[PDB]
């Protein structure tokens, strides 16, 4: 599909069985999801943004479906105000920027 | 052009007669550039992101050339970790997300 940028590019994604709304973010290297109790082993990580850094939990090889498009990879979980789909997953669904 | 996301989507922009490198960011409502001098009056503003909020200077109706395409809009200047072109200007150059 083709998504215009008049409003925030939010789409539905499926992870850990739950359906959530997430922002297609070309400005994020990684995918960061709001705090949620995901099972599995994880590693600590710090990610930076505007303002500073926050601590998050890193989970590897987590299946994520974006608009019916299947992907799998690293997902970071922490105190973010919005669910963010970064480039690590965007490249997997053949997403590009065009103008 | 069509831009893939295996690497950060950086492009050259020209503003105030200067050339700079900026990140095409669909996850940002506004455009925020690193501290620099710009003609005109500016109003203090605050914007937020992953690691909290920061104080920025707001300049209105500023011409910005992005990859050869012209845009004229609001440009925020402050202590951002990187130059960011947000949706306010991305929509002006007809940018979209596709997959």
């Amino acid at each position: 599909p083709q998504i215009t940028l008049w409003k925030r590019p939010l789409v539905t994604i499926r992870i850990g069985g739950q359906l959530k709304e997430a922002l297609l973010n070309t400005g994020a290297d990684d995918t960061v999801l709001e705090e949620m109790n995901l099972p599995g082993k994880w590693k600590p990580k710090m990610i930076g943004g505007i303002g500073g850094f926050i601590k998050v939990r890193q989970y590897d090889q987590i299946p994520v479906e974006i608009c019916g498009h299947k992907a799998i990879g690293t997902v970071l979980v922490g105190p973010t105000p919005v669910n963010i789909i970064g480039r690590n997953l965007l490249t997997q669904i053949g997403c590009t920027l065009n103008f | 052009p069509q831009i893939t996301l295996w690497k950060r989507p950086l492009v050259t922009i020209r503003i105030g007669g200067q050339l700079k490198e900026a990140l095409l960011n669909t996850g940002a409502d506004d455009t925020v550039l690193e501290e620099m001098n710009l003609p005109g009056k500016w109003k203090p503003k605050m914007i937020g992101g992953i690691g909290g909020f920061i104080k920025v200077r707001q300049y209105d109706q500023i011409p910005v050339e992005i990859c050869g395409h012209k845009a004229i809009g609001t440009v925020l200047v402050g202590p951002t970790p990187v130059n960011i072109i947000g949706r306010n200007l991305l929509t002006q150059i007809g940018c979209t997300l596709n997959f």
Binding site: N25, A28, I50 | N25, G27, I47
Partner: peptide
């Protein structure tokens, strides 16, 4: 507004 730049470092 909200600027969600994320540095994977």
């Amino acid at each position: 507004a909200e600027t969600f730049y994320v540095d994977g470092a």
